[PDB]
Symmetry: D2
């Protein structure tokens, strides 16, 4: 049992035990949710089937959100076992690595901009389009954003724009799907060393600096994010939609804390 | 049991079964919290002792947050049974009624401004000052705000300023008390017909208009707010501090929905 | 001597006397800037040439911001007469019109999303990239956004996401180009019945509701926007960068009028 | 003919040549406004009289915004020479200095809170109340805020709550007085080492950190603020009301510099 008791939730973006999505699925399973999982490529298929089985799940489906056909086929497959379900977790963010390195205006390109927005923002509503009919009243959709949406952060570059697009997507999706009984929210997570840190310069220094100046004096964990995510996909959060909830330890609401 | 299992939480502001604080205490008791209650005047003493006893609580204490002595005496009394505890719910908002009626610049007065800010904003940190030593690591403080803080709303008038002050109070309190292990948040609730609606002109029309244009197509309840409040005072929300969480059905994130 | 007196500013997006960019151009000329103009396509050439002539400009250049080579060629042409200059006004917004009716989730498509973000957001930084070495210290870049970036507005649909991207683009560009002396801002303008209102359902009522609830009790004009734009590209605004300035008469800061 | 050319504006808060209000007054005079000045107390009279004389003004009036009768008497005096006028600059911020060291929860008191909100927030609407019938259509009111209203800044403490109240006051005043032709805005200025830095711990490093992380790579000046203030009280900004304009060089829109 748990406060996600009679709920069936699809979880994207589990790539490793460090993934934010892994922490979310963990917390959701602990709270009684029945889970289903997607995986981007075949390289990831073995790993996700394993994590799903640890969390009581036989439903592991391929989904590359670059492709409308892949999304449709995956929801068609899901419908064979979950004719209806209660929402999904969107934990997919991507820009070509060279976009995330230097001066933003020099780094950004039309293609890097296109990919970053396509994969990190459009895919969320593409997923909602494809399963809109499958959602129960009381369903909840969730995505992961970052402070780069609201502030100019060195090297985050075009992902910052893509996350700002995603946060607007949350609002427009909540406004369109609310009347039929679906809520849509985001968590704006503090930095976490996941595979999304691969190749990012000065990530350790960024983490240290966050730990010093966040009001809770630590960086957040996939367990912190998972607990908030479970809440936001549960009926306990029935009054919250279209909201970007900061799960950052309070980092974003303070300033000039570094000066001791 | 529940996710507030080993937690002792003080609840202010229970005035009637309609109070937001009543809904919060209900949800908190359901989730296993041990509760204590304050009451403003003796007129309210009988009623609150009753609600507290329904929720398994013998701890009902007088507290007029206009008075530093009253706050100190109440925490001294509380310490006799709760030497330490795990946070409190601040559900106190007040401005002299004549402040909340007409054109803001004509209505507001120095004294109405003083009272509104004193009772609705300063009292939150006055309460934290008085019990700071009593708080356990992992404690959480919560207050109730309203969209009037962020937007100019007809007739809300100086309460709008007082709520903006309160939301800044949340941030400064979270920044000062985080390192020692206390989180501080607010819920920005949608309108609810409580005793805070007494004498407010066009409250029914305001409620109707909210129900039409909120993405979830209903107004929020003290049960919605109570569930979010329970979460935000629980260890499930360990990664959230200094945040104003909108529990408004998405009302604040949409615009020009009234035009059908 | 106006407060843009020694400045040379490139103005995109003039398509009619109703355009926001026409109001911006007039104001900037009124304050003594020297101006240059771009036109999207051959359909619009003759009109932009005429408008530029009325404002005393000989510099009228094609620029279709869908294409990197079009932007590059335009700035190479501009460099023949303006080897360095002091910024540009980005007044370009576009999504396929089918994107802007009805339920947002049903209306949006991958291609409609792509185009809206490419044309309305990426093109701002694409332009900055192509002219970065031509920008004098003290330069200012300016774009136009809308409250649909911040709040879910019926029918604005994917343009709201595109504008949210554009406002983030403002911050990232300001952060990147500030050290070399360039400021980057946006105006978030209230609704104006320009060519950008074409085919949009219930535009007249939206203005009417806006005229009723805005604090100043009227909708804004391209004159209002042009005056704020001139300030934002002038040295008077040397302390402002990365900012989205609301020029909507206070509409966005109000709530709960009419019920 | 400057862009405030036919305007009469009352300027509060000139206490030294370093004051933000001194930079605002100079800019407004430069743009052709006629000016009037208030002074808090007898300590400051002689200096404000001198400054007003340098800017060509004979109108120098006492006003202690702690007291309703002081504000009323000042506007009665002003009405003898300016029966109607076009707005005022509110440049008044104050909390007892013990409020602005150390841990916020330990530093704040009921009285320190009262004073900070009374003097820094209520006094803006108190002034508007006392001169409302004297305001010409097209009038503009302006106040100064700081980023401590929006984010928790060490040591700024209760002034951050007071500034958050003041920014809400801007919105509520703009909403109330817009129908009669008055706009109300604020400038959220970056840190400037004025008399308001007196006794504030680590002010020099805060400027140094600010100079490093702000996009424009310098802190702002009273010249930068005065130019934005002149625009905001001029008819050039007729489309802007209820707005908090950040004039901090883009500091607030950045994060994660230095680590
Ligand atoms: N790690 C942080 O600091 C942090 C903080 C806030 C938000 N985020 C965001 O959290 C979300 C999860 O990232 P993470 O930190 O768990 O790292 P991660 O690498 O473990 O998860 C990212 C997942 O995106 C999936 N993905 C990428 N392209 C895809 C595609 N075309 N189709 C389907 N799936 C695709 C990947 O397979 C991966 O599983 C991302 O959106 C990220 O931007 C990360
Ligand atoms: N009802 C709404 O629409 C709504 C929406 C958002 C926020 N709020 C806020 O929620 C909170 C609770 O209000 P409510 O709607 O439950 O109405 P309510 O009247 O039931 O609760 C308000 C409580 O404030 C207490 N109070 C007032 N002055 C006090 C004092 N000097 N000392 C101690 N206690 C004092 C009162 O006793 C009352 O119990 C308030 O802060 C209110 O501003 C209300
Ligand atoms: N009219 C409003 O209510 C309003 C309010 C706020 C912001 N805006 C925005 O202001 C800006 C100007 O819009 P407007 O109202 O003046 O309408 P408009 O139609 O007069 O201007 C739009 C211009 O964008 C140009 N454009 C479109 N695609 C282009 C491309 N691929 N390459 C080059 N140019 C291209 C068009 O030629 C046109 O000149 C837009 O960004 C719009 O989103 C409009
Ligand atoms: N200096 C900064 O870093 C900074 C940045 C942003 C905003 N501000 C704000 O700008 C405004 C002007 O401050 P400043 O930096 O020019 O310092 P300042 O000391 O030169 O100006 C403050 C003025 O407030 C006046 N004042 C105080 N109490 C008063 C009262 N009861 N009645 C009448 N007048 C009273 C004072 O006489 C003084 O003239 C303040 O509101 C300040 O909070 C300052
Ligand atoms: C913090 C922070 C993060 C983590 N986080 C918030 C994200 O959203 C990270 C998305 C992200 C998207 N695409 C990526 C990668 C990461 C890198 C590996 C992947 N293999 C890749 O090729 N492309 O990334 C940053 C980048 C620059 C500066 C700061 C940060
Ligand atoms: C919505 C809405 C609310 C409810 N809510 C958000 C609040 O915060 C209400 C605080 C509030 C404070 N003080 C009050 C009262 C209410 C009135 C009864 C009490 N007996 C009194 O004397 N003084 O109040 C409004 C007032 C005007 C316009 C809209 C609203
Ligand atoms: C307000 C408001 C506006 C004006 N505005 C702020 C904009 O940014 C309008 C961009 C926009 C982009 N692409 C468009 C068009 C318009 C339509 C004609 C053009 N010929 C077209 O084919 N495609 O448009 C709206 C649309 C729906 C709801 C509200 C509004
Ligand atoms: C930045 C910054 C400022 C400047 N600034 C934005 C303000 O608004 C400063 C208001 C302020 C109000 N009251 C004060 C004083 C200052 C101190 C001298 C005066 N003589 C006094 O007695 N009381 O002050 C800070 C204080 C702590 C941390 C950061 C800052």
């Amino acid at each position: 049992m748990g406060f996600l008791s009679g709920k069936r939730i699809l979880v994207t973006g589990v790539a490793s035990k460090l993934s934010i999505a892994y922490g979310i699925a963990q917390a959701m399973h602990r709270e009684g949710a029945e889970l289903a999982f997607t995986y981007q490529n075949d390289k990831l298929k073995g790993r996700v089937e394993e994590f799903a089985a640890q969390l009581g799940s036989d439903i592991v489906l391929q989904c590359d959100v670059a492709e409308d056909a892949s999304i449709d086929t995956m929801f068609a497959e899901l419908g064979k076992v979950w004719p209806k379900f209660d929402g999904f977790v969107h934990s997919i963010g991507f820009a070509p690595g060279d976009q995330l390195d230097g001066d933003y205006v020099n780094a950004v390109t039309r293609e890097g901009f296109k990919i970053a927005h396509d994969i990190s923002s459009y895919s969320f509503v593409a997923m909602a389009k494809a399963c809109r009919s499958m959602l129960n009243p009381g369903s909840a959709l969730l995505t992961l954003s970052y402070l780069g949406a609201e502030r100019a952060i060195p090297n985050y570059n075009v992902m910052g724009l893509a996350k700002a697009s995603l946060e607007a997507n949350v609002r427009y999706m909540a406004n369109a799907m609310g009347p039929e009984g679906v809520r849509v929210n985001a968590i704006s997570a503090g930095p976490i060393r996941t595979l999304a840190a691969s190749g990012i310069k000065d990530f350790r220094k960024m983490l240290a600096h966050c730990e010093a100046v966040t009001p809770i004096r630590r960086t957040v964990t996939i367990e912190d994010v998972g607990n908030s995510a479970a809440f936001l996909c549960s009926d306990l959060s029935a009054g919250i939609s279209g909201e970007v909830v900061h799960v950052d330890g309070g980092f974003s609401i303070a300033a000039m804390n570094e000066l001791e």
